UniProtKB/Swiss-Prot annotation, chains A, B:
It catalyses: phenazine-1-carboxylate + S-adenosyl-L-methionine = 5-methyl-phenazine-1-carboxylate + S-adenosyl-L-homocysteine. Pfam families: Dimerisation, Methyltransf_2. The gene is phzM. This is Phenazine-1-carboxylate N-methyltransferase. Keywords: Methyltransferase, S-adenosyl-L-methionine, Transferase. It comes from Pseudomonas aeruginosa (strain ATCC 15692 / DSM 22644 / CIP 104116 / JCM 14847 / LMG 12228 / 1C / PRS 101 / PAO1). The lineage of its organism: Bacteria, Pseudomonadati, Pseudomonadota, Gammaproteobacteria, Pseudomonadales.
Amino acid sequence: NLAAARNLIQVVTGEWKSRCVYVATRLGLADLIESGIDSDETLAAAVGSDAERIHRLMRLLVAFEIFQGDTRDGYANTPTSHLLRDVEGSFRDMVLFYGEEFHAAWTPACEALLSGTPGFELAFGEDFYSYLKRCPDAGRRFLLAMKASNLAFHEIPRLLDFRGRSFVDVGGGSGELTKAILQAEPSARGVMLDREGSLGVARDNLSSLLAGERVSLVGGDMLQEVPSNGDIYLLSRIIGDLDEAASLRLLGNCREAMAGDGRVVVIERTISASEPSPMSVLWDVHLFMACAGRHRTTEEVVDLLGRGGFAVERIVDLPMETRMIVAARA
Amino acid sequence: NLAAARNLIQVVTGEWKSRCVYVATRLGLADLIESGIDSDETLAAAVGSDAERIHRLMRLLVAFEIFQGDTRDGYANTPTSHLLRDVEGSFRDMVLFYGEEFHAAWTPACEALLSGTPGFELAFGEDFYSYLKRCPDAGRRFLLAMKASNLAFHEIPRLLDFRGRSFVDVGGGSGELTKAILQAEPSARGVMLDREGSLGVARDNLSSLLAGERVSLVGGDMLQEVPSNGDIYLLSRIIGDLDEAASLRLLGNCREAMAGDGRVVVIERTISASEPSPMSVLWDVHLFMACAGRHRTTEEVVDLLGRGGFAVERIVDLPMETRMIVAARA
């Protein structure tokens, strides 16, 4: 009952820790501190607070190993708080977006789980993808939030050998996975496929790589055709939105288009059918809350790969509860 | 870097777990399950949801050891989920209040820590205790939420001997501490003091014990006078709100009123000034967010006791980050 009350209270009050991290990010404390503004007084002066309130917020965060030090010798960053800094590749924009849009989305979680309308849609009056287009700047902020998952993408070219290979990023969106591969392995060449008229974001995000002729963009419908003669076909976050049939159209398109000995690589969160990792299932509820998305089990994807003519060769756990499943032609 | 990123995401997404437990609580899943309604399908029909959403919620809660089992063989409670049930001493009402009023309070946390206006006041346009006194239903719910802390009160008569002895509950409020003592030790006798005109709640909450003539109530100002000849003077969540001057008046009132070899017993959350427990400091920021209160360090309480002519005899760590400090006449 004691351990149980203590664990329960941790979970109940976890939200207040999220808020405190969000406030530390909004206030730019991690930046100020790295700069040497590192006392209660100087921090309070910089952000417009009071020294005692800063002291209390800092005491909390330090106790949870987010920052370190004290007001007298000075506060400093820890590996976790460095991620809050306003620097390339940090988690700052993800923290802010999650503490704003997704904080609002998770407020009507009860009515969402009862009705089946995502909490996001209840909170904002339109579906998520609609919101990113409507609400001014939301799209830009969300792409910055998503850069946080360059964590999994940076691992792919460390696990998979792209040296002298051509790859096809099917349904690439902004091009972050293509970008990460091409940054890591200079002899690799890619094609990114997306809907015609959808290539603008990628044209800008990939401008230097396009200028260097390391990549080309193609407009097309992946269900009708994929760019041919690739060695590796990346399906990143594609399968989850597709039903049995469209998934088999897509997989058949890659199976027939790829070079001899080519591979299909599915990159996606999948849930272990038994003993799922607690974080993977938290992401799964979140996918509902955000957009009524649904995850497959690892088994369902492996079996789906088989029905599309592939033999799985590797299943690798990536950062942020993402899997990489590599399949060759059966 | 992997490890830091995994930690940050845990903290950032912790809020969604709080929302998931709040939802299970609002829906009465633990009650339903205890009564044998224990599949996704029967749970869904019971609450007006759908089997798939229940499945995903329950998968999440089970993975975090809140419930156990599975839809086929049936879900079942755990020591943690038993605390959510609608039973006398559970955390159920605390979870609900924290997921409603305090979830609202913690939304403007940034503006709160900058301005100094508690998030509760920002959110509701009204200070916390004014809100409780004005809105009888909110006041009722808050009292039920504060019952979760009866965990600490029930330990008190196990650590102190009230057999044969008399106590004075100074600032007793609704009277839960007095009631915990008399229920544990039927031969204890006690007086509860509070401000005249405030005794309504306690007169009701303690009706039985008042009818048994085991306890009486007195209306009065503790800063001028306290009931005399007590063996044990309980100061529960009373000093925290008092300045130096007021605390020394109260302590002197106790020192002069008490029996030979009497004790003053301070029950309060305090912060260890050197290496504080992360949970104690989270409670401290929450106290600000709710009503601009704050906790003292343990050292400050010990030093204040000494200034009031007391010597600390014992310090005991009670449940839910609360301290019991026993002092005798120096």
